[PDB]
Amino acid sequence: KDLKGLYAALLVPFDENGQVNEQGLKQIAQNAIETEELDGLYVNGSSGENFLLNTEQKKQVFKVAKEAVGDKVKLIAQVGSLDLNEAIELGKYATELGYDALSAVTPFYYPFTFEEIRDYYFDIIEATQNNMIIYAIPDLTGVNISIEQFSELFNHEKIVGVKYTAPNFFLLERIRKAFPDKLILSGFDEMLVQATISGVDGAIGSTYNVNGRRARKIFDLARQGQIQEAYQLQHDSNDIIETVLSMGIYPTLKEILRHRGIDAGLPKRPFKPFNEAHRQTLDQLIAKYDL
Amino acid sequence: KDLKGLYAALLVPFDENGQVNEQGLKQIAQNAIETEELDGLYVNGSSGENFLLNTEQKKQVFKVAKEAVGDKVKLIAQVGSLDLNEAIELGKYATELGYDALSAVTPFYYPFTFEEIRDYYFDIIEATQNNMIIYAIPDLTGVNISIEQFSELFNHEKIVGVKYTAPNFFLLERIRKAFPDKLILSGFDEMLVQATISGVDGAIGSTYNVNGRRARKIFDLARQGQIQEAYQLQHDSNDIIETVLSMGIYPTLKEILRHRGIDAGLPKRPFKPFNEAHRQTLDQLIAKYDL
Amino acid sequence: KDLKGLYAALLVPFDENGQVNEQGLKQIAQNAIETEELDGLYVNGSSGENFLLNTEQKKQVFKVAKEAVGDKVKLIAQVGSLDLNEAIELGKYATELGYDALSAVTPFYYPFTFEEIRDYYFDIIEATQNNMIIYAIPDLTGVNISIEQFSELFNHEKIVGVKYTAPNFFLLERIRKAFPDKLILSGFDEMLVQATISGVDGAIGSTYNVNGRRARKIFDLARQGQIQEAYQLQHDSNDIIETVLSMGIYPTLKEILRHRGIDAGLPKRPFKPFNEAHRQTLDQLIAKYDL
Amino acid sequence: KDLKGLYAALLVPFDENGQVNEQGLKQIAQNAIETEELDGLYVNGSSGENFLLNTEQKKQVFKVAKEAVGDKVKLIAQVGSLDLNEAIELGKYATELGYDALSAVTPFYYPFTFEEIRDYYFDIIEATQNNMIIYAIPDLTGVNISIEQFSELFNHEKIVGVKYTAPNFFLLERIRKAFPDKLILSGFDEMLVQATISGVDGAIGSTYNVNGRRARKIFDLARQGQIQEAYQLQHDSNDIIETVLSMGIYPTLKEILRHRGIDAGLPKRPFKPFNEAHRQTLDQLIAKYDL
């Protein structure tokens, strides 16, 4: 498949022991495709609480998400881990399930050299033979990739693109110009309109689980040149994003899904549950925007 | 004169002793208006090497720049200084010359509280009675202004707007929505197109001294919805900006102006002159983009 | 046991598949106690490449290290993980082996609230019933703990102390004064002398695997008031530390151990092996300091 | 006069219009020497609100402070400015008054290259022919100086030392070792004891205006090896520093001086006066430590 389009970063519901609720996960995956009308799922990303999970649980999430959607739906599997053996194990498993591409966060925590980071990507690709999307998230990792470093990664024919999240539209424009044939998917929901006019091929986001229909309008209207209409929809989307961030984003998004009849469970500790102090303000937002 | 529009941040040529060359300053001012077709000048900003000047030289720059241009040209006087007495003296001086508004950088160096910063603006206004534009440049000052802080400043009727430079389009969008009737001029030339679609009322920029005609097209095309054409001109403009940044932006911009026959002098020490190692690369840029 | 003293942060040797070499691990543990004359081991810390390992491998490292040392040797088990279920599983396993205390890195990657971080610690303690040492490493995690936050943690009778690494001797002094009866172990080998005079109870370090005898002299001489002698030994130790950092610290420390006849193996990918370009310079250092 | 020793960073009292109160400035200078028993004054530093003053006021402060004290008192004149012409004028002026050395903050605000910073120092020296002390204060300037950069500066015979404030005792130790014959004066009052054991030749500090007698004991006791006693006085001194920092350090220090009957005036706007909400807490501190 052409991997352009809009993707939900799949949220995962848990029980009080931090185990995956598979029936709720199935519902969330179906919500993103059937109700939010998205093109695909980005599975076991940050938004899925992936870095709090064990290896068997990550496989559970990949299996369930793949079983919950039709064959037209695009699937990207985030397999990055500080344990390269585990990234490779996950990448094979996701590839064999039929995921269209793998993705991996830049190695973090330790002050890896860029050559070490480069060869992490190359090693995953060698072992899996699948296409790879760089997951660049300096806000969480503290790792920043320069254009020269992007050029060295993109020189590999199987590094087909990037999930781009640095709040830097100068660097985004330089990448877009230097690599016209690579895939760039923006990961900053609150700046989708600016990404869109900067030539991104689509976007991956946690908030698209609840606001995917407005997001598709932002994208489509901006590309049409109906720029005032698209920005108004960005203003509305940012009211939502700002609100859910103030309340704790992943649990609050899951509370929005619960309101729709989904068995949305709990976050995985050490994330705490949605605080009920925020309930009235969340209710007003859901009403105001028909969420 | 409502102050929407495109402004050159006026560059200043010095002699070997760091004194102002009034003739070249006049030629730079005229170039911005006549040749680059800009709406106005932002005078004694960062780009004017203002923070390296003495008081008498800052007054000199204000007088020369205003004498150089006709009465239809919009003029904003940057008068911020760590010396509040100096800021007020300069503010009265520029106000008496007939500058259309004042602007002031946030106090920097010392860890001032927000109340101290707020009351610096309020004291400048009380003493000058001119309208005031906040100059927000965290990349240089390390001072960041939150939405709640902007709300407090903008609650003052004579704080009419902001020269906004933080590389944050979420904050920009929140400001635009919260203050639909304040003036927002963006100060990041390399992200003019994203600023424009985010609803800015114009822009102030050092590179507009050499590339103001493309900048006008970006701003006009984007607001008309010809977003792909506007973005292509951003790509071209970003080749120029990236190149001059790599060579030393203020001296390199003055060297491009010297190519047009302007007496562009030298930077003020401790800035060094343009390094002739860059000459070949500069000539290729000038030829490629007809600068 | 009283947990005061000097500890090696245990290094782990791997094969090319990233599996633990148990015979080499045994040798490294014996090196730290018998040759370097240290008081204990800090097991599965950052220096042991812990965050690159799977759960079964972490258990392997705990088992082997415990089997390699006598009953007088103090053992601290680092069990922090982003997976709380795994931290608890490891904490029980290490407790049942007889480790004297558990330790856990502050949760990282996600922007956890402090209440979330607090209850991660409290949850581990509830499940394991062992004493707990906070592992504060802002250089790697980006998480900073304030004195007020330290006070809330130390209010728990089973949080007995901290492995302190923030490069902040004002905060260290405030903690030392506010909590005279808690255990403070410094983790910055290059500032051991300053830690010692700031009243730390001991120190944990990767470089003590090769330089533990000088480190004990720094500590003992500084406490005696032989401050010039202790600082001279810090100058010598910092030549070593600076050198090994420039070459890649964990592999280079392991190459020093290899020189002693230890089966020191390889780092775990994505860490690369020691580069042989550095061999001559490493040889000169080993000679100069008898390592 | 070799310039080792303990210096007050001289505080300046202003009237309501931000003009210097020469009588109170004299009383502050005399207090530092007579009552606090210090070796010298560091004049027109950050603590003197120097960066808020005009040129004529900076000269005024130099003249008043030197007239206030006897010829045995060591005097260092801070003359750094973003205006290099001003720095040279002030340097010549202080040199003619008989100041024992000059000092200068690293140029800040603009992103100057290291060559530009290096040649600012060299140009001040060439024009003044006085000895020069680097004022390194990254907390305020955002400029950090590496060991290799220090090597280049110290290769100049008239750069005799540094006022060192970076919170980095590894760098301090490397500098002390590499340059055994340069003057290193530390500028972090709250870490005087750690500086002293790291081999500094003295210290410059704003809190020594009120607590110089304890500071002398810390410095002397630590160099004698009575490290526990020196550290207890650091604990006491840090109660004072933490308290004044929380209240607004320069106005709060002047308020402590007003308690001794000194005409301590006001801070220069945009600094606000001491907030009387803090009065009770300040009085308790003054009583507890006999300030």
Residue numbers in the entry:
A (entry chain A), B (entry chain B), C (entry chain A), D (entry chain B): 3 to 293
Please quote the paper that reports this structure.
N-Acetyl neuraminic acid lyase (NAL) is a Class I aldolase that catalyses the reversible aldol reaction between pyruvate and N-acetyl mannosamine (ManNAc) to give N-acetyl neuraminic acid (Neu5Ac). The catalysis of reactions involving fluoropyruvate as donor by N-acetyl neuraminic acid lyase (NAL) variants was investigated. A combination of mutagenesis, structural biology and computational chemistry has revealed insights into its catalytic mechanism.
The formation of a Z-configured enamine was observed, which presents only one face to aldehyde substrates. Reaction of this face of the (Z)-enamine intermediate would necessarily lead to the formation of 3R-configured products. Previous studies have shown that an analogue of DHOB – (2R,3S)-2,3-trihydroxy-4-oxo-N,N-dipropyl butanamide – can bind to the E192N variant of E. coli NAL in two distinct conformations.15 Aldehyde substrates may react via conformations that allow protonation by the general acid Y137.10 The facial selectivity of the reaction of the aldehyde determines the configuration of the product – (3R,4R) or (3R,4S) – obtained. Wild-type NAL catalysed the reaction between fluoropyruvate and ManNAc, albeit much less efficiently than with pyruvate as donor.
